[PDB]
Amino acid sequence: ALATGVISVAGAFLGAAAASNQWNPAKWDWTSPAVWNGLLSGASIAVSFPSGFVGITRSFMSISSNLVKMIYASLMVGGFLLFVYLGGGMANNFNFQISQWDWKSPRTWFGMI
């Protein structure tokens, strides 16, 4: 690149057109910090915030409109009350289904099988 001259002069001084140095002149005392930077970038993958996210399986960068009911139900099984209150998911609550169960009235049952 910038220093093709010095390598070309050093390379011309090789015995019978044989590569004896094998990229020696580039590293007599010249540094190589970009390769070192690449090695440090490759070798360093550190997650320095296992405070509250730690132990997570799924995450949503946003809410999908088609999957609204699924994420609402999965929050519902975990006892998170901020969404099923407004979404009308009180039919999905087992305690309400079994408390409204009228004995000797098949219309009120909710038995899956």
Partner 1 sequence: DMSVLGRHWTLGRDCIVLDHGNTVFEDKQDYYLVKDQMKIRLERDWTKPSANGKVLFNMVGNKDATFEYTAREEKWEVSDGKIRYVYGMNNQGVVSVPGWADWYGPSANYDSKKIHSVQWNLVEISSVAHRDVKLKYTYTPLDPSTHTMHLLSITDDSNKTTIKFSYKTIEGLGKQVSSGLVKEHKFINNKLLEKVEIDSPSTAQVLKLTSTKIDSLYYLESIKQDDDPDPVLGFEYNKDDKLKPRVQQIRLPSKSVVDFKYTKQAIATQQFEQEIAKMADLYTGNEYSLEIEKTVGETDLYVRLKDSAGKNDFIKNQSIRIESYRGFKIKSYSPFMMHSYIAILVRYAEEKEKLHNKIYILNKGEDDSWKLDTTNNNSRVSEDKKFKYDFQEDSFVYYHSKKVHFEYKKSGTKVWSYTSKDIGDVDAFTLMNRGAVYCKNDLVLIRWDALGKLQQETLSDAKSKPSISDVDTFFEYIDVQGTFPEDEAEAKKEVDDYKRDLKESLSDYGLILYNNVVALRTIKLSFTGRITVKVLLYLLKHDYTVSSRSSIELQGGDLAKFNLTLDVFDEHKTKNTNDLDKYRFEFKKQGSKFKLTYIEATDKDNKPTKPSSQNEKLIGQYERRMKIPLDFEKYMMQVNQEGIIVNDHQIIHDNGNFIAKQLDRDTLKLTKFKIPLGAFSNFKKDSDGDEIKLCTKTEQERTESCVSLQTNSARNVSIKYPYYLVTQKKNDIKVLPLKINSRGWEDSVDYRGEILHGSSSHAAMVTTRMSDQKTIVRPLKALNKINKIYAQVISEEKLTTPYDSYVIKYEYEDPVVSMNQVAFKTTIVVPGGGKSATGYYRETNDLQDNQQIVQVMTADNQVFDPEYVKRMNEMQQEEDKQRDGAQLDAEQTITDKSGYHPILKTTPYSANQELVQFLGFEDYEDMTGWTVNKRPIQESNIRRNEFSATGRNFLLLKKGE
Q: Could you tell me the smallest distance in angstroms from the CB atom of residue 34 to partner 1?
A: 5
Contact at 8 Å (CB) between 89 and 96?
A: no
Looking only at residues 94 through 113 of this chain, which bind partner 1 when binding is defined by CB under 8 A?
A: 96-97, 99-100, 106-113
**6: CB partners within 8 A, 6+ apart:** 25
Q: Could you tell me the smallest distance in angstroms from the CB atom of residue 37 to partner 1?
A: 4
Q: Is 10 in the site for partner 1 (CB under 8 A)?
A: yes
Looking only at residues 42 through 61 of this chain, which bind partner 1 when binding is defined by CB under 8 A?
A: 42-46, 48-61
Distance CA(71)–CA(33), nearest Å, equals 48
Three-state DSSP class for 26? helix
Among the listed residues 88, 94, 103, 104, the single contact to partner 1 using CB under 8 A: 88
Q: Could you tell me the smallest distance in angstroms from the CB atom of residue 104 to partner 1?
A: 15
Contact at 8 Å (CB) between 72 and 81?
A: no
Looking only at residues 24 through 43 of this chain, which bind partner 1 when binding is defined by CB under 8 A?
A: 24-25, 27-43
Q: Could you tell me the smallest distance in angstroms from the CB atom of residue 91 to partner 1?
A: 4
Count of residues that bind partner 1 according to CB under 8 A = 83
DSSP for residue 9 = H
Q: Is the dihedral of CA 50, 54, 58, 59 positive or negative?
A: negative
